[model samples]
Target: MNIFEMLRIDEGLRLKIYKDTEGYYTIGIGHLLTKSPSLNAAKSELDKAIGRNCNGVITKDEAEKLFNQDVDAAVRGILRNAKLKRVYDSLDAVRRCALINMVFQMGETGVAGFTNSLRMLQQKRWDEAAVNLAKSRWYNQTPNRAKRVITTFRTGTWDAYKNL
Candidate 1:
């Protein structure tokens, strides 16, 4: 197992108050000094959705809220990122949606690693941008999902992509 998982298993994944070896209070895999705001927000929303239990339950309703929240933010980031790269607008929406969907998975900063791809995107070179996408570790790791999005980049169409 990876170090973080090994650490989680070894350290114990606690979501409640407890004391560790140093005899200090802790929660959430050895967190006490600081709590992440985004994680706390998500945790709060999750608890609200299905009560604070270790069962890890959440409803479709709650999932939808999370999806909308994240997707909206992704879209906003996509617009800004595209604009910064001179990639232009959402006319047909796929190109822009392509950018947003990318930001969805890779994160806005992750796309920053793909300058050639961004340049191709900025020039609206759909196929070349898709080709550029294939050059990434993201593509090798998740070729299916990569293809789904890259098809959108290649086609400038939402057919196989958004529907898929």
Candidate 2:
């Protein structure tokens, strides 16, 4: 499936797309912010943002450029860090993107703070992962956003965007 399909991009999120408070066309996916663009642009930006960094080395400027170019990639980049790599593996594309988005905003170290949650996901413990995802500072800080995506991850239905 395409990334959008995998991530279940829906009309509600599309309608929420707008130039952010910073003037970038930012798409709100639950609690996450994606750089808004045409489908082709978004894909290109995601590819570049998550593209392999030689020996896993990515400069701050390169990372910033990726984020500016595609928020999804920025998220991927954060998860690409060495410490996170240990916890991130074998995830479906959508889950990877969702987690990456979370890591993007919360720094790798911060994202790693959800160690139990990550472990649950890695262990295929869906219910536990969902619960743990909601117990962190992130959930408390952005309940609506966290609920939306966490629900998606838990149900795997993508009903939130079924019409899209």
Query: Which model scores highest in TM-score?
Result: 1
Residue 86 in model 2: shift from native, Å? 3.6
Q: Per-residue CA lDDT of candidate 2, range 1-164, in tens?
A: 34344333421233233443334443333222345545445444434445752232334454444435545654566557754675556566556656655654565778777778877877778888998898877788667657766866676555544444
Tens digit per residue, CA lDDT, model 1, 79-163 = 5764433564623555665566666555678876788887877777777878888998888976776786688678766555334
Alpha carbon lDDT of each predicted model? 0.57, 0.55
* Highest lDDT model number: 1
The ten-residue window of minimal lDDT in model 2 covers: 8-17
Every candidate's CA RMSD: 11.2, 10.6
Worst 10 residues of 1 by lDDT: 1-10
TM-score of each: 0.62, 0.53
- Evaluated against the true structure, the overall lDDT of model 1 is 0.57
Off by over 4 Å in 2: 1-79, 161-164
